[PDB]
Ligand binder design. Structure first.
Ligand SMILES: [Mn+2]
Ligand SMILES: [Mn+2]
Length: 566
RNA sequence: UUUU
């Protein structure tokens, strides 16, 4: 069947769409070559559509049918609870889209009458109406990247399809738990979203060490969400239905499956009819959990067919990275070839063909890889990195365009040990932040999907609990990692690394001098900027009131919000 | 204007 069906009515905006980096006297401090930057807009959505729209052929062999049965048996283990409206409302991000029915995120979190009195009517319908497709909206997401080295190759806008605010709250009421528990339950260590970046690195290594002669690789299917067949979605529901649900829970899951998840009509920001979606909806709660299981399923099934000795895979939504036992160069090469032939048969073609790798630091998945460096005492230390182009790109864009969701903060947390995040991001912003003095001002960034309100003043404690004290003392970085950073810098036109120690030494001492948590930031977050690094003892609060549940499971697109870690 |  066709992933989508268009009518002519267009994907339209509802706000002003910039798409160039304004000559921000501060952006020039973080990035000279402004040009190198841009932000997707509506004007390039159709290109996205054409890319996205295609026919789907899928066939199900035995391996698939068996693997699935297995997953269901683990699923049978889980038990999910229904969620109270209060519980769902409070999970709604403070800035989520408002409802056509005259009420928004704020009215919800505060449990307005007009709000709940809708969520309630919405949840009743989900029990009274079992066939009617449910209306979804289609927007183009605003996204900033760096101009492709092909001077002109710009990424077309991404697309987001989400159901009304009321339908989203009910989703949480019926699946939140399922989605927060069931995945792991089914996939064991294969579930990516359960690790912090250091647990991921750790896992990736032990695993790579567990093979006599390891061979790893990753597989990136093309436009995953469109490759998802209404069959794929129905199967996912079979998995969900193995949990021990409450009838209204169980029934809602049913209703949403046929009414929202398998597909439905598309409306634009202006009430116009855009057409039909018959593939995964990018903006649903089940979006991630559904992708993780499908990638997992189809891959574990492809592995058997292709015959890869001792496969240990790591799934993260449509993101996949499998490590196994090598059988020979000319052997592995063909083996993987069979793997892509199976995956494809399952309606999961690759963007680029997968390539077997024999270096762990070379395998890259989820636009990041495993590199090495050294801690204080110099004991080798693994940390998870990535190419900083986008991150630096996005950060300069935000510096000039106060953005709703600060990708920079998110980067800092996740990649805290990276050379680029310590010397360039942390510096650039704490200078900004400290010049306006907004250290208490809690901004929003996001992790594995869900949103999070954090106070920059707590990075110290948060950074340690996720990376350890090594996060604040890594020095011998790998030559290759170093060149990757250096180069990106040159590209965007950013001043060499050694030049930031100076910009730091200061900002770091203007915090030292503010005492308190501020002074704590200055001590740990900038110890690399002093010609005399001082020893760092564990942070008291850090490991103490470490409010968690952070890396338990993905929710990208789910509209999930949590405000813990001060 | 919503956060795959
Ligand atoms: Mn894709
Ligand atoms: Mn990806």
């Amino acid at each position: 069947s066709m992933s989508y069906t268009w009518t002519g009515a267009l994907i339209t905006p509802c706000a002003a769409e910039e798409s160039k980096l304004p000559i921000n006297p501060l952006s020039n401090s973080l990035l000279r070559h402004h040009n190198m930057v841009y932000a997707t807009t509506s004007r390039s959505a159709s290109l996205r559509q054409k890319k996205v729209t295609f026919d789907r052929l899928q066939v199900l062999d035995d391996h698939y049918r068996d693997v699935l049965k297995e997953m269901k048996a683990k699923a049978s283990t889980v038990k999910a609870k229904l969620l109270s409206i209060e519980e769902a409302c409070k999970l709604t991000p403070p800035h989520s889209a408002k409802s056509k029915f005259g009420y928004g995120a704020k009215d919800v979190r505060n449990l307005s009458s007009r709000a709940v009195n809708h969520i309630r009517s919405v949840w009743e319908d989900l029990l009274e109406d079992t066939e009617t497709p449910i209306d979804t909206t289609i927007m183009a997401k605003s996204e900033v990247f760096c101009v492709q080295p092909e001077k002109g190759g710009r990424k077309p806008a991404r697309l987001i399809v989400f159901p009304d605010l009321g339908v989203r709250v009910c989703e949480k009421m019926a699946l939140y738990d399922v989605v927060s528990t069931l995945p792991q339950a089914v996939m064991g260590s294969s579930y990516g979203f359960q690790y912090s970046p250091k647990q991921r690195v750790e896992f990736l290594v032990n695993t790579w060490k567990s093979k006599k002669c390891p061979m790893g690789f990753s597989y990136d299917t093309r436009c995953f969400d469109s490759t998802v067949t209404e069959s794929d979605i129905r199967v996912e529901e079979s998995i969900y239905q193995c949990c021990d649900l409450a009838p209204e829970a169980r029934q809602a899951i049913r209703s949403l499956t046929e009414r929202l998840y398998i597909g439905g009509p598309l409306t634009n920001s202006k009430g116009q009819n855009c057409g039909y979606r018959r593939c995964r909806a990018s903006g649903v709660l089940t979006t991630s959990c559904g992708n993780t299981l499908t990638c997992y399923l189809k891959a574990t099934a492809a592995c058997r067919a292709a015959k890869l000795q001792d496969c240990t895979m790591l799934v993260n939504g449509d993101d996949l990275v499998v490590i196994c036992e090598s059988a020979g160069t000319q052997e592995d090469a063909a083996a993987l070839r069979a793997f892509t032939e199976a995956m494809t048969r399952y309606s999961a073609p690759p963007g680029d063909p997968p390539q077997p790798e024999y270096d762990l630091e070379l395998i890259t998945s989820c636009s990041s890889n495993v590199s090495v460096a050294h801690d204080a005492s110099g004991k080798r230390v693994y940390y998870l990195t990535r190419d900083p182009t986008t991150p630096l790109a996005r950060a300069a864009w935000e510096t000039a365009r106060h953005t709703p969701i600060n990708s920079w903060l998110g980067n800092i947390i996740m990649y805290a040990p990276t050379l680029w995040a310590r010397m360039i991001l942390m510096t650039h912003f704490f200078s900004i932040l400290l010049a306006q003095e907004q250290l208490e001002k809690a901004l929003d960034c996001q992790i594995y999907g869900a949103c999070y309100s954090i106070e920059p003043l707590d990075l110290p404690q948060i950074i340690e609990r996720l990376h350890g004290l090594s996060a604040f003392t890594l020095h011998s970085y790998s030559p290759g990692e170093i060149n990757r950073v250096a180069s990106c810098l040159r590209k965007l036109g950013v001043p060499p690394l050694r030049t930031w120690r100076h910009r730091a030494r200061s900002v770091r001492a203007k915090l030292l001098s503010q005492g308190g948590r501020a002074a704590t930031c200055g001590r740990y977050l900038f110890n690399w900027a002093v010609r005399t690094k001082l020893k760092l003892t564990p942070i008291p609060a850090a490991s103490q009131l470490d409010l968690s549940g952070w890396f338990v499971a993905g929710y990208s697109g789910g509209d999930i919000y949590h405000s813990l870690s001060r």
